[PDB]
Ligand binder design. Structure first.
Ligand SMILES: Cc1ncc(COP(=O)(O)O)c(/C=N/[C@@H](COP(=O)(O)O)C(=O)O)c1O
Length: 430
């Protein structure tokens, strides 16, 4: 840890501005009735990037961390040559989160959710005796499983049975990581609901999803990487969204950077995207509603089965909560896009051909939205554009590797019995 001290911060309730000390894992302001995110106010007002040996923690001034964990990697930002020329753009930057050693990208789990894992796990008390509970569509689960296994952190994952192929590892994991799943046909929110049932057990505590400032501020290191590389704040931020937490985080990073002052005073326009036919946040945004629209549960689950990008389908995202995605899009003058599977597949091929690495379908959704925005005349050719490639390099990383898969200890019906779930998860760690 050489010259490290725990990051100093307080919390602010976004709805009221009330400022208070984090007593430990606060996910909300107990004094605020309306649903609201809380947001860190960092005492280190101006960011000082630490040396490369800090890995992901080089951004620790604006991460709510009490220690550093070994073996982390930061996002990498570089100026595009091939893709930029294809799109006619003069100032296209790619922030790459995954495995691409030729550019210095060494996130071995192959997605930006590694930033969440290293941030959240370093916020946790090392003497913590409760089991951390995380729900995920796959990539967050893989990152947390690896970090928690390596660090002997007790972790209960809830992942849809249909998504467990995402839970691959180079070597067997420590038994301190256990998995439960909702049955086949269930979607990400079904796994979230299952995790809420498990959390009724004493001895378990919620990671909290978008409510966890460590998750948001970890993802925001993509923007911190881009701004400190470029030397100014981009005009546009492109990211594919399921919950929207990474776009909320990008906005929050932008606000902190403006307060720092050294990088300019402009606000990046958020350009977010979903994969048709699972586009409920797009639909709510285009309607002008801060509330998610009616969406029959069975139709939503079927739509989640159709999309290529299985991580972009949350029926109950942080859209309307104060500080959530509606507020972020309003504050940034943002826009919402849809990509079909066909567009995402074209984008994956385009990125591999012109930039030299494979990317996930979710990242292809983001790139497809950039292709479409450029074709629509929305992006001036000199604009500074940040394309957040949220996952990639899995094909290269897996080559000539024998993988081990984390499989569920229990699979539960979509509406499970509470006493059954609680007894079973208690026995997993007893
Ligand atoms: C490669 C990739 N790109 C984009 C996203 C969307 O992230 P968001 O900003 O939080 O919606 C994801 C989200 N993955 C999540 C779905 O998580 P989420 O709770 O929506 O943040 C998962 O792995 O559990 C992703 O894996």
């Amino acid at each position: 840890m050489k010259d490290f001290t725990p990051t100093p911060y307080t919390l602010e309730c976004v709805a009221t501005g009330r400022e208070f000390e984090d007593t430990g894992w606060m996910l909300a302001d107990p004094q605020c009735k309306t649903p609201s995110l809380v947001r860190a106010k960092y005492a280190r007002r101006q960011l000082e990037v630490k040396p490369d040996e800090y890995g992901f923690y080089k951004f620790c001034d604006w991460l709510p961390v009490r220690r550093m964990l070994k073996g982390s990697s930061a996002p990498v930002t570089y100026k595009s040559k091939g893709l930029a020329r294809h799109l006619g753009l003069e100032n296209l930057y790619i922030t790459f989160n995954g495995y691409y050693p030729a550019i210095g990208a060494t996130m071995s789990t192959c997605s930006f959710k590694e930033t969440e894992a290293f941030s959240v796990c370093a916020r946790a008390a090392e003497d913590e005796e409760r089991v951390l509970v995380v729900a995920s569509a796959g990539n967050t689960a893989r990152a947390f499983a690896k970090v928690c296994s390596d660090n002997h952190i007790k972790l209960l994952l809830s992942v849809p049975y249909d998504n467990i192929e995402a839970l691959w590892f180079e070597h067997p994991l420590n038994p301190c990581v256990k998995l439960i799943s909702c049955e086949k046909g269930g979607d990400y929110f079904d796994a979230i609901h299952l995790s809420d049932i498990a959390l009724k057990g004493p001895g378990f505590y919620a990671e909290g999803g978008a409510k966890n400032i460590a998750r948001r501020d970890g993802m925001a290191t993509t923007v911190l990487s881009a701004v400190t590389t470029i030397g100014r704040i981009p005009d546009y931020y492109f990211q594919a969204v399921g919950s929207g937490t990474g776009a909320i985080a990008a906005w929050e990073a932008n606000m902190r950077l403006i307060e720092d002052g050294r990088f300019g005073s402009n606000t990046m326009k958020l350009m977010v995207s979903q994969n048709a036919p699972f586009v409920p946040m797009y639909d709510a945004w285009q309607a002008g509603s801060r509330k998610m629209l009616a969406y029959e549960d069975d139709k939503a689950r079927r739509d989640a089965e159709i999309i290529d990008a299985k991580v972009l389908s949350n029926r109950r995202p942080p859209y309307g909560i104060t500080g959530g995605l509606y507020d972020a899009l309003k504050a940034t003058g943002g826009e919402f896009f849809v990509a079909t599977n066909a567009m995402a597949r074209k984008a994956r091929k385009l990125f591999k051909e012109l930039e030299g690495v494979d990317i996930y379908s979710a990242s292809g959704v983001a790139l497809a939205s950039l292709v479409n925005a450029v074709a629509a005349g929305k992006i001036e050719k000199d604009a500074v554009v940040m394309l957040n490639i949220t996952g990639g390099g899995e094909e290269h990383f897996k080559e000539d590797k024998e993988l081990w898969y984390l499989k569920p200890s229990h699979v539960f019906p979509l509406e499970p019995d509470t006493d059954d779930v609680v007894a079973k998860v208690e026995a997993l760690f007893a």
